[PDB]
Amino acid sequence: SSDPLVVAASIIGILHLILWILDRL
Amino acid sequence: SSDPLVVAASIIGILHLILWILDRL
Amino acid sequence: SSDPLVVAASIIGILHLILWILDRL
Amino acid sequence: SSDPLVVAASIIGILHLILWILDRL
């Protein structure tokens, strides 16, 4: 388990990457 | 809970993203 | 130890960086 | 505490940001 803030950052970073890729596709 | 260094990195990454977005808005 | 989602994000971020560098080299 | 791989990713990400900023300064 992780600090909730670290969980939140991790979700944000993954979503960031997915959106960036979709934007380029 | 997380290593303090991981907490720090997570805060930095979120702030990074917020600043980048504000810069573009 | 970390939340599995944080582990996954960390692996993704490292791979992201490695691919970006290889792309530029 | 965190998974060592998460610690490593966090260090890499911070160093990444510091290098990127120094490169731009």
Ligand SMILES: CCCCCCCC/C=C/CCCCCCCC(=O)OC[C@@H](O)CO
């Ligand atoms: C298109 C807009 C996209 C915006 C993405 C950037 C969003 C930035 C906002 C981040 C909010 C983080 C929410 C964080 C929510 C969890 C905070 C918490 O309760 O921490 C407690 C622990 O420390 C206890 O150990």
Ligand SMILES: CCCCCCCC/C=C/CCCCCCCC(=O)OC[C@@H](O)CO
């Ligand atoms: C260019 C923008 C790219 C980012 C787009 C993101 C859009 C949606 C924003 C995502 C923020 C989701 C943060 C969600 C973070 C939830 C943290 C959590 O797990 O709650 C606490 C538990 O750990 C138990 O205490």
Ligand SMILES: CCCCCCCC/C=C/CCCCCCCC(=O)OC[C@@H](O)CO
């Ligand atoms: C506009 C400038 C923006 C600069 C952003 C980049 C900043 C880079 C500096 C990072 C400082 C990280 C602070 C880290 C502070 C926590 C360190 C710690 O005590 O770790 C102990 C644990 O390992 C025990 O398990």
Ligand SMILES: CCCCCCCC/C=C/CCCCCCCC(=O)OC[C@@H](O)CO
């Ligand atoms: C382009 C620059 C984008 C980044 C801008 C960032 C500006 C502000 C810098 C943020 C650094 C905040 C790091 C703060 C990290 C605090 C770590 C902590 O939580 O203390 C230890 C506890 O976990 C308990 O031991």
Ligand SMILES: CCCCCCCC/C=C/CCCCCCCC(=O)OC[C@@H](O)CO
């Ligand atoms: C070239 C394409 C590259 C795509 C990279 C982006 C991929 C985005 C997808 C992310 C999938 C994340 C998998 C996450 C797998 C672990 C989820 C989990 O079981 O969490 C449980 C814990 O919360 C219990 O505490």
Ligand SMILES: CCCCCCCC/C=C/CCCCCCCC(=O)OC[C@@H](O)CO
């Ligand atoms: C521009 C694309 C850059 C990203 C390319 C990534 C391509 C490959 C995708 C990587 C996703 C790997 C996620 C793998 C995450 C595994 C999480 C895990 O460790 O399982 C659970 C355990 O913690 C125990 O419960």
Ligand SMILES: CCCCCCCC/C=C/CCCCCCCC(=O)OC[C@@H](O)CO
């Ligand atoms: C200028 C080049 C910059 C390259 C930056 C990218 C480097 C990519 C390489 C990453 C190596 C990660 C090292 C990771 C070292 C810790 C691995 C580990 O022992 O994990 C065990 C835990 O899972 C047990 O729970």
Ligand SMILES: CCCCCCCC/C=C/CCCCCCCC(=O)OC[C@@H](O)CO
């Ligand atoms: C554009 C390149 C930007 C990245 C430049 C990075 C250059 C230096 C590379 C950094 C990799 C450092 C990874 C160091 C990761 C150490 C993980 C660790 O803490 O060991 C295990 C403990 O947690 C206890 O088991």
Ligand SMILES: [Ca+2]
């Ligand atoms: Ca932990």
Ligand SMILES: [Cl-]
């Ligand atoms: Cl963690």
